[PDB]
Amino acid sequence: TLRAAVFDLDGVLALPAVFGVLGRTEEALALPRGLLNDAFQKGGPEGATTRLMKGEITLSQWIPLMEENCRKCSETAKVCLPKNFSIKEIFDKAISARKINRPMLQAALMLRKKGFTTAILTNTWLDDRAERDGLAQLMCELKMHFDFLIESCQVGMVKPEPQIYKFLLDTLKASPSEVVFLDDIGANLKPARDLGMVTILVQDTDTALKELEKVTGIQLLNTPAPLPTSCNPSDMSHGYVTVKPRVRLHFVELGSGPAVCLCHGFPESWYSWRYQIPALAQAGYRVLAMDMKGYGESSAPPEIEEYCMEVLCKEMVTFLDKLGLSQAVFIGHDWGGMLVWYMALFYPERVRAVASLNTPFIPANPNMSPLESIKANPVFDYQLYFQEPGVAEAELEQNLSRTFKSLFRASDESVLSMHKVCEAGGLFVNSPEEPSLSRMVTEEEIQFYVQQFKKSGFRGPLNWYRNMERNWKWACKSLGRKILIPALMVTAEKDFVLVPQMSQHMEDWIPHLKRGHIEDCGHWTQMDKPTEVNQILIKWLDSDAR
């Protein structure tokens, strides 16, 4: 019974195969059939290619030896190689053209999700070309989805030598009969088969996956659309910056490129961006997913005024200063969305671009107290319940699992009224003691938030809602300004508090505003519709932020 799946790289996890390009080059240059593939494998185990695949030499040392084999082969075939014949060029192009075979990777992901130990076993080289970063990136994206990456040039062994298979079995801690092995080269399959492993000769992906699903008994083909890659907290780079003597800010960091600062809402975490962090880093950005003040590993001072917009924005500026960042793109959701519009209004020079999920930008009304304005809309009643220090802390902190299980639900799963919260005397008075687990979250994701909130609880988070008068006075100073830097507003159809229609007058203050819209999406945007969120953000980033 199978418990491990092994994949080749070239022609299996990555397409098109480099060997395929040698043939394509022969045809394009009208060279004798197999001349290049013959020069490539020249000398077999004693040849230049074996030495390269074993790690004896690097790719740049191999290029001249391949040139010589190509000359020798053409001499024997009584033919001439063209004037501008360059092996470097042929390989540079082939390596660059090679992309991840998404359905193969998707099938590997599914097997690992169902308990399989997965591995990549590849005959590869030590790449020292000026353009090696493209291959480095490919391997990076691919390798993180597997338990093991076994590279011929790193182990000093090569397929089809029997020892690399014995090494593989030892790495997997598995007996041959427990292993499925997938290769596009029949000769490299032969030793695994001889050892007793299940083998699949990969020609077209679809037939390979039909074979793979028949042998594992797990559906790999015609599967529903998979969720984006998420984050395992213990595998992340965690960062800490002191912004002032008693305030430290925590963030999770992933990727290289322009800095993208992610700002969560209430009562959330850096983890609310779990589905965006890998996707945004893969799109070519340096992601900084914050634990906002009062949350997670960030400090939680008890004073209400430590949570007004002016102080929070000043701290985020200091955060940039301490990291040596002149700018960041600011993406926010809910309370993070509010802060992000204020960063754009007060510090435009420090904000590369600004994006908000659900949170509209509505200028302050100087002719009306903010407390009057909140009373005008019944959906904002929960905010008045959040006013009195201690009351909402008591209900929210009583049972953490019940809190997050009641809150983090989709539009078709609500257990929460909201409206007449004050009258009913609580957010959870008509909610069950043991809510069912929402389709958006697993038990373990709820427990990550539970553990996070055990440190400081809900005082610091609730204080974000306790600065209406302070926020309003500060916001009134910005009344003559417009937001003229790149800006994106993303509305969610089924958010009943931050409704799409509330954002309708935004173009008056943000003339060049760009928009996104997510259908059948509730308040918890990132986890409700991750794929859609990722598509809207990546497209807006590549077009407007670099």
Ligand X SMILES: CCCc1nc(-c2cccnc2)c[nH]c1=O
Residues of each annotated binding site for phosphate:
122-123
Q: How far is the CB of 183 from ligand X (least distance, A)?
A: 49
Asked if 109 interacts with a copy of itself (CB under 8 A), we say: no
256 contacts which partner out of a copy of itself, ligand X, none, CB within 5 to 8 A by kind?
a copy of itself
Nearer to ligand X, 237 or 501 (CB): 501
Distance, CA of 151 to CA of 489 (rounded, Å): 45
Nearer to ligand X, 55 or 337 (CB): 337
Q: How far is the CB of 342 from a copy of itself (least distance, A)?
A: 12
Q: Which of residues 225-264 bind a copy of itself (CB under 8 A)?
A: 234-242, 253-256, 258-259
234 contacts which partner out of ligand X, a copy of itself, none, CB within 5 to 8 A by kind?
a copy of itself
Asked if 482 interacts with a copy of itself (CB under 8 A), we say: yes
Are residues 234 and 249 in contact, defined by beta-carbon separation less than 8 angstroms? no
Q: How far is the CB of 350 from a copy of itself (least distance, A)?
A: 6
CB atoms within 10 A of CB 488: 24
Asked if 414 interacts with ligand X (CB under 6 A), we say: yes
DSSP tally for the chain: helices H, then strands E: 24, 15
Displacement of CA 196 from its chain's centroid (Å): 38
Half-sphere exposure at residue 426, Cβ-oriented, CA atoms within 13 angstroms: 15
512 contacts which partner out of ligand X, a copy of itself, none, CB within 5 to 8 A by kind?
none
Nearer to a copy of itself, 41 or 327 (CB): 327
CA angle centred on 494, ends 492 and 495, rounded to 5°: 70
168 contacts which partner out of a copy of itself, ligand X, none, CB within 5 to 8 A by kind?
none
Nearer to ligand X, 223 or 411 (CB): 411
Asked if 92 interacts with a copy of itself (CB under 8 A), we say: no
Query: What sign for the dihedral angle of Cα 307, 310, 313, 315?
Result: negative
Distance, CA of 72 to CA of 49 (rounded, Å): 15
* The three-state (H, E, C) secondary structure of 46-67, written as one string: HCHHHHHHHCCCCHHHHHHHHH
Nearer to ligand X, 123 or 525 (CB): 525
Distance, CA of 360 to CA of 501 (rounded, Å): 9
Q: How far is the CB of 351 from a copy of itself (least distance, A)?
A: 9
CB atoms within 10 A of CB 78: 7
Distance, CA of 469 to CA of 476 (rounded, Å): 11
Nearer to ligand X, 43 or 432 (CB): 432
Distance, CA of 322 to CA of 326 (rounded, Å): 10
56 contacts which partner out of a copy of itself, ligand X, none, CB within 5 to 8 A by kind?
a copy of itself
Interface characters, 259-298, with ligand X (x: CB under 6 A):
-------x--------------------------------
Binding-site positions: 8, 10, 122-123, 184, 382
Query: Residue 355: beta bridge partners?
Result: 331, 488
Instruction: Name the segment binding ligand X (CB under 6 A); options: 4-12, 173-181, 315-323, 490-498.
Output: 490-498
418 contacts which partner out of ligand X, a copy of itself, none, CB within 5 to 8 A by kind?
ligand X
Q: Considering only residues 247, 418, 462, 487, which one is a binding residue for ligand X as defined by CB under 6 A?
A: 418
Nearer to ligand X, 55 or 336 (CB): 336
Asked if 546 interacts with a copy of itself (CB under 8 A), we say: no
Q: Annotated catalytic sites, by residue?
A: 334, 465, 523
131 contacts which partner out of a copy of itself, ligand X, none, CB within 5 to 8 A by kind?
none
- Count of positions on this chain that bind a copy of itself (CB under 8 A): 59
Q: Which conformational region is residue 201 in: left (phi greater than 0), alpha (psi within -120 to 50 degrees), or beta?
A: beta
CB atoms within 10 A of CB 259: 21
Asked if 150 interacts with a copy of itself (CB under 8 A), we say: no
Asked if 127 interacts with a copy of itself (CB under 8 A), we say: yes
Q: Which conformational region is residue 428 in: left (phi greater than 0), alpha (psi within -120 to 50 degrees), or beta?
A: alpha
Q: How far is the CB of 293 from a copy of itself (least distance, A)?
A: 16
Q: Considering only residues 184, 213, 495, 532, which one is a binding residue for ligand X as defined by CB under 6 A?
A: 495
User: Please, which residues have CB within 8 angstroms of residue 540's CB and are 6 or more apart in sequence?
Assistant: 353, 355, 488, 514, 516
Q: Which of residues 32-51 bind a copy of itself (CB under 8 A)?
A: 51
Query: Which residue type, as a one-letter code, is found at position 518?
Result: I
Element (H, E) at 170: helix 162-172
Q: How far is the CB of 509 from a copy of itself (least distance, A)?
A: 12
Displacement of CA 393 from its chain's centroid (Å): 33
Q: What does the block give as tokens for 25?
A: 């080059």
For 55, 175, 400, 418, 475, the CA distances from 404, given in Å and listed in that order, are 52, 43, 6, 15, 32
Interface characters, 284-323, with a copy of itself (x: CB under 8 A):
--xx---------------------------------xxx
Are residues 231 and 212 in contact, defined by beta-carbon separation less than 8 angstroms? no
Strand order in the sheet with 148-151: 148-151, 117-122, 4-7, 179-183, 198-201
Nearer to ligand X, 352 or 409 (CB): 409
Q: How far is the CB of 429 from ligand X (least distance, A)?
A: 15
Instruction: Name the segment binding a copy of itself (CB under 8 A); options: 107-115, 126-134, 189-197, 359-367.
Output: 126-134
Are residues 241 and 288 in contact, defined by beta-carbon separation less than 8 angstroms? no
Q: What does the block give as tokens for 428?
A: 């959870």
Nearer to a copy of itself, 209 or 353 (CB): 353
The DSSP bridge pattern shows strands 117-122 and 14-15 to be unpaired
Is residue 130 packed enough to be buried (19+ CB in 10 Å), middle (13-18) or exposed (0-12)?
Answer: exposed
Q: Which residues bind ligand X (CB under 6 A)?
A: 266, 407, 414, 416, 418, 495-497, 522-523
Q: Which residues bind a copy of itself (CB under 8 A)?
A: 51, 55-58, 60-61, 126-128, 132-133, 135-137, 139-140, 143-144, 154, 156, 234-242, 253-256, 258-259, 281, 286-287, 321-327, 346-350, 352, 477, 480-485
